[PDB]
Design a protein around this nucleic acid. Structure first.
Ligand SMILES: [Mg+2]
Ligand SMILES: [Mg+2]
Ligand SMILES: [Mg+2]
Ligand SMILES: [Mg+2]
Ligand SMILES: [Mg+2]
Ligand SMILES: [Mg+2]
Ligand SMILES: [Mg+2]
Ligand SMILES: [Mg+2]
Ligand SMILES: [Mg+2]
Ligand SMILES: [Mg+2]
Ligand SMILES: [Mg+2]
Ligand SMILES: [Mg+2]
Ligand SMILES: [Mg+2]
Ligand SMILES: [Mg+2]
Ligand SMILES: [Mg+2]
Ligand SMILES: [Mg+2]
Ligand SMILES: [Mg+2]
Ligand SMILES: [Mg+2]
Ligand SMILES: [Mg+2]
Ligand SMILES: [Mg+2]
Ligand SMILES: [Mg+2]
Ligand SMILES: [Mg+2]
Lengths: 203, 121, 52, 153, 51, 123
RNA sequence: CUACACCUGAAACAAGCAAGAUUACCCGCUGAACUUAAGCAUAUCAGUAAGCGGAGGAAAAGAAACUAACUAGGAUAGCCCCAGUAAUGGCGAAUGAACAGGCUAAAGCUCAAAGUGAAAAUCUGAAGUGGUCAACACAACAGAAUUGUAAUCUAAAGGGUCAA
RNA sequence: UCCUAAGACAUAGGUUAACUCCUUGCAAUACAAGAAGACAUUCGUUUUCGUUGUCAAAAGGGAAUGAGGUUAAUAUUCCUCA
């Protein structure tokens, strides 16, 4: 199938072909707005694996997010508190870039529902992603038993609640196992859970 | 093609009228006209020594008017209602929150009379 | 800290006021479970309760 | 500005072999002939399928079974054509030069070489569209011909 | 002063009306405890908010 | 001088109800003019009576007009929002039963060829 | 060069979608000091308050890239235990889970990826016709779609050949 | 009420986890954004010229009224006259 061929291409990214296609792309994207709507999916074999389909009710958007780390937003680098807390430069943000992309898309296009996303390439100061959204107001998405689930009230803005593959990763959820125990069911909930002081009417 | 100008401008596009497909609400579809009714325009007559002195002496009637009404609206409404020719209308907003209208009839009519028919004597 | 007694083990060191669990529902809960089970039987009537 | 600049970069930069090999296109004569042949091999439009389904249903439902012929079709589509290239079944491969993104078509040429299938670069995706009753197609292929056309193949 | 918004006029009018005393006949109802209007206000001793 | 009965009103035409409306309103104004000049308790009561009356008349007129527009639009979806169901934003925004239960092919197949059976064990 | 096709972008219009509210519980972020170490920086208070963004009736989680090495077990969640244990800590103050085992509850499923190529078999809208007429069934005509819709398939399989 | 000022805020674009934040009269860190005419008089047709917003002054700018008389309380406002 053409798709396996594509896959291996993209797993070949160093080859002069790939590098070339990329520098070129990246250039295009740098030319377009920060968040713009794509007409097609630059990477169809990938978008498929995430459940894009060409049928009305599917949309793709490109976002470029800033590469970097999180400088702590306090003014003049001033932080009042013990030496462990004063810190600014070397901090790294909890959620991953991909997720950022998802959420910026999500907010620019709040009507739609983010299904997924994939890397379209990155330059020195950026990273570009395409985000796959389904339109819940479109009967095609509604009547399709496969994606109709994302149409119901409970699935609203899943990028922002970290229910996206990116979110799940940021939550360490890509690990099931005893190293993951603390993370399961929201490490705040795991924590509240243990922290609970239980008092039973008998004893 | 050939460009006289240095700058681009957006081509003129055919912009259709806004055509509803379904009527948005009952009223709309029923083509309801929101004009204030004549009797809601003129509300109440005024009895105070002032009002009366104005009716006897100045050929004037004093009435409370619907707040959102205009002067011309008052002139018309007062004619349609009372069969009189209104020479002038003047407007007050009381602090109490009402519109006083000082109305002067033409030489044709006599305020005292309209007073008499209305039950204002 | 006075006598020979065994070194205490702190409990209430954090703010536990937010973190206490109360067991009064237990009473009714047991009951609910009962009725659930029973209403299962009735709706499953010809068939057995627990699967093989 | 974009559209133009894309073109300009593509011209002023160093384009690699694979991308450049899509610059080789049949001179108008060759192309046109090819389009004539392929056009003769065009696949069914809707009306034609309705006619034939209705007609055959009436023939089989009323009189009796009739001997039917294995139809001679034009091949269209990336996955299908790729398979048909893997399976040696494709007699001719015709690729559009105009595809974006190029990745989609880039494995075709060396694929065809390894399978010893003849492959051509044509200019238009729209052209291939018209041949196939779509807006645009990446590639078109031939499997069967009928005696008359063997000469052309 | 002289110059006022509508809003103002209307608000002032409101508070002016609300500043009446309990009507002498309300005190005769069967279910009421109200001898007087507890909410009355005097311009000199207490000021409204209009700006 | 009598109370107004609803059914009686629903008996008449639109014209009728309208004419009556206008009359009633004129009545009111005359009456308030009563209050203002000099008036008898009869006139005071008259007021409340006529007010309520006018309300009633209007109510009827709208009932009729409404049932009429609803009539025209009966049968079509894309009625005016006035008439469309109002329950909750969440209610309308939700999926259908058709869609709730709606099932993928493989599923209909398993449901046919496997499904659930009535059994009994004996002891 | 024209007509025309396709890719890309734009305006107006039709039909639908989002914008705020809610606080107890839920999700994703952000994030301190008082306090305790009888001082105090690590630490503790503590991922705690405050702050921000999202929901729901619950949320989240879930069909193993799990345990365990035994004559093994087997999604997720809660209860009981394991336990104040292993470990973490100016090894100071003080932090601190899980497996096995007893229960409650029980449920398993959909995609991408060689295979319609004897033929897009697919999806959406629809003047309309029947209807329980807002909710259903067909539907002339239109779009979406081979830079791929639907049938098979999802590793517990599966394709091919038989077949009760 | 209109106008512009010191100023200010949208829109567009960009920044932020997000909230927020940065630009804009010499108008933009923006820009396929406008106005007019005529026939038509709807569209449409047609023509012409064109880069793109708003708020902020009851002492600033700012189309034109005066005298006499009247009320218990208004009046360069009502009345009379000009
Ligand atoms: Mg599309
Ligand atoms: Mg930075
Ligand atoms: Mg960052
Ligand atoms: Mg989930
Ligand atoms: Mg409960
Ligand atoms: Mg003042
Ligand atoms: Mg004072
Ligand atoms: Mg004071
Ligand atoms: Mg287009
Ligand atoms: Mg909200
Ligand atoms: Mg304390
Ligand atoms: Mg101390
Ligand atoms: Mg800790
Ligand atoms: Mg709710
Ligand atoms: Mg314990
Ligand atoms: Mg167990
Ligand atoms: Mg219809
Ligand atoms: Mg079509
Ligand atoms: Mg200025
Ligand atoms: Mg400024
Ligand atoms: Mg002047
Ligand atoms: Mg004058």
């Amino acid at each position: 199938g053409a798709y396996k061929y594509l896959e291996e291409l993209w797993r070949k990214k160093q080859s002069d072909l790939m590098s070339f296609i990329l520098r070129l792309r990246t250039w295009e994207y740098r030319q377009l707005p920060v968040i713009h709507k794509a007409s097609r999916s630059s990477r169809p074999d990938k978008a498929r694996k995430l459940g894009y389909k060409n049928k009305d009710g599917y949309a793709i958007w490109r976002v470029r997010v800033r590469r970097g780390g999180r400088k702590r937003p306090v003014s003049k680098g001033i932080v009042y508190g013990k030496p462990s807390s004063v810190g600014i430069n070397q901090l790294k943000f909890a959620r991953n870039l991909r997720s950022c992309a998802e959420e910026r898309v999500g907010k620019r296009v709040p009507e739609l529902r983010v299904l997924n996303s994939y890397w379209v390439g990155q330059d020195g100061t950026y990273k570009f992603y395409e985000v796959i959204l389904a339109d819940p107001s479109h009967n095609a998405i509604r009547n399709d038993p496969r994606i109709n689930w994302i149409c119901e009230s409970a699935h609203k803005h899943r990028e922002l609640r970290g229910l996206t593959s990116a979110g799940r990763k940021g939550r360490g959820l890509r690990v099931k196992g005893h190293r993951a125990k603390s993370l399961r069911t929201s490490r705040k909930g795991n924590w509240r859970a243990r922290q609970m002081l239980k008092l039973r009417r008998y004893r | 093609k050939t460009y006289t100008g240095v700058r681009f401008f957006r081509p003129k596009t055919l912009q259709l009228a806004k055509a509803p497909k379904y009527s948005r609400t009952v009223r709309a579809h029923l083509k309801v006209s929101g004009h204030l009714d004549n009797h809601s325009v003129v509300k109440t007559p005024l009895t105070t020594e002032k009002a009366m002195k104005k009716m006897e002496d100045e050929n004037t009637m004093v009435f409370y008017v619907h707040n959102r009404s205009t002067k011309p609206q008052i002139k018309s409404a007062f004619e349609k209602l009372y069969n009189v020719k209104v020479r002038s209308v003047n407007t007050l907003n009381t602090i109490t929150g009402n519109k006083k209208a000082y109305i002067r009839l033409a030489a044709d009519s006599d305020s005292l009379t309209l007073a008499n028919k209305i039950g204002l004597i | 800290m006075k006598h020979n007694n065994q070194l205490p083990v702190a409990q209430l060191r954090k703010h536990q006021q937010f973190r206490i669990k109360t067991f009064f529902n237990q009473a009714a809960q047991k009951k609910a479970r009962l009725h659930a089970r029973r209403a299962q039987a009735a709706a499953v009537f010809p068939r057995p309760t627990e699967k093989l | 500005t974009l559209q133009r600049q894309k073109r300009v970069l593509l011209q002023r930069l160093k384009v690699p072999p694979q991308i450049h090999q899509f610059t080789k296109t049949l001179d108008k004569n060759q192309s046109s002939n090819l389009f004539k042949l392929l056009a003769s091999y065009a696949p069914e439009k809707p009306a034609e399928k309705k006619q034939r389904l209705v007609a055959q249903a009436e023939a089989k439902k009323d009189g009796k079974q009739v001997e039917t012929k294995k139809p001679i079709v034009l091949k269209y589509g990336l996955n299908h054509i790729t398979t048909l290239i893997e399976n040696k079944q494709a007699k001719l491969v015709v690729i559009a030069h105009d595809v974006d993104p190029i990745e989609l078509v880039i494995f075709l040429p060396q694929l065809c070489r390894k399978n010893d299938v003849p492959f051509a670069f044509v200019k238009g995706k729209a052209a291939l569209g018209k041949l196939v009753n779509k807006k645009t197609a990446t590639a078109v292929a031939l499997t069967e011909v009928r005696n008359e056309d063997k000469a052309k193949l | 002063g002289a110059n006022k918004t509508l809003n103002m006029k209307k608000r002032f009018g409101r508070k002016i009306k609300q500043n009446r005393p309990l009507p002498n006949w309300y005190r005769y109802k069967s279910d009421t405890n109200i001898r007087y209007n507890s909410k009355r206000r005097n311009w000199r001793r207490t000021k409204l908010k209009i700006y | 001088d009598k109370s107004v009965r609803v059914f009686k009103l629903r008996t008449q035409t639109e014209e009728q109800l309208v004419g009556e409306l206008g009359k009633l309103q004129t009545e009111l104004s005359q009456l308030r003019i009563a209050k203002i000049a000099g008036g008898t308790a009869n006139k005071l009561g008259r007021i409340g009576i006529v007010r309520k009356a006018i309300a009633k008349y209007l109510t009827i007129i709208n009932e009729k007009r409404r049932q009429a527009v609803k009539d025209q639009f009966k049968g079509k979806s894309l009625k005016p929002l006035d008439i469309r169901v109002k329950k909750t934003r969440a209610i309308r925004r939700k999926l259908t039963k058709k869609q709730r239960e709606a099932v993928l092919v493989k599923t209909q197949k398993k449901l046919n060829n496997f499904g659930l059976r009535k059994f009994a064990l004996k002891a």
